[PDB]
Design a protein around this ligand. Sequence first.
Ligand SMILES: NCc1ccc(C(F)(F)F)cc1
Ligand SMILES: NCc1ccc(C(F)(F)F)cc1
Length: 330
Amino acid sequence: STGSATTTPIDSLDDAYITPVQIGTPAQTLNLDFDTGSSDLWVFSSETTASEVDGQTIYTPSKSTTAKLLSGATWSISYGDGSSSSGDVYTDTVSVGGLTVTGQAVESAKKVSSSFTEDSTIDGLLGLAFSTLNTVSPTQQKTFFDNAKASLDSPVFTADLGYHAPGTYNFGFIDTTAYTGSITYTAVSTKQGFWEWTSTGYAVGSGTFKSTSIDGIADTGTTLLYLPATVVSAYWAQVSGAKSSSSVGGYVFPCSATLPSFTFGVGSARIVIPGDYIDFGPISTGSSSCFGGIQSSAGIGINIFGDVALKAAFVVFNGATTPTLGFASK
Ligand SMILES: NCc1ccc(C(F)(F)F)cc1
Ligand SMILES: NCc1ccc(C(F)(F)F)cc1
């Protein structure tokens, strides 16, 4: 079987992408943030503290004839940005673009951090990293992808995120009309539970390509591109007036500047991020200082190929027994 669903940016800056997901019987449709950097499927629900819900669509397990409470199970997650949520666990039927999994663990939020409350357009997250990172206790639960794997035509899913435009998540098949040229596959390490791979280098604008190994993770759940300080300094040095601002929390640049492209290596192939993808607009309304889409990973501890990088490519997440990542231009 296969599944295909349209994913849509939540705002004008592509800060995140939401994808409709059907949960329960009869279907309750929630718009979830597909996150290859985490492994929990959690949703706003009728159990969430009322003061922490502000416009989100909630999952109501008592109205689903297929929902079953997972006795004694709890979950608690903390994301790298400081966000967090926690609650109890149900099992229920979950469908993505025609692809149905029965008995999927649906984690019901009882408490969410402020960053989720203020994001009225995200009803929850659908984790697509490896199941070893799932936070359900005392019995760890499997991801949607892991549960669907055996029934998929091919054990893959693909991410085709749009620039200021809708895109597609496909499960079980590779749309050969969605990309140009060939797909270049590269090795994945699962030792940390992430889709972790090694980029072969980078170039700034039309500059020389620098061959250097950059270990990082492919994370649809992170907005920006987080790279080592040496790389990020080399990029912003080519932008007149750009500087690192401690008060803002990263590199900013004059909004009137034109940004150079950024190239990263995948084996012998090259993925080019257009300069416009790196512009994330004024730091505050009316400001002439703009926030950069490439930032340092020094404070994070890991390099993150977030949406800024992934939306420049067609990305294959190959969940075979030896997993690999595929990148193609589009
Ligand atoms: N998108 C989920 C996520 C959040 C944080 C991290 C970090 F920062 F710990 F690497 C990775 C993945
Ligand atoms: N990396 C996972 C993640 C995704 C979205 C959010 C936000 F923006 F909704 F708070 C936080 C953390």
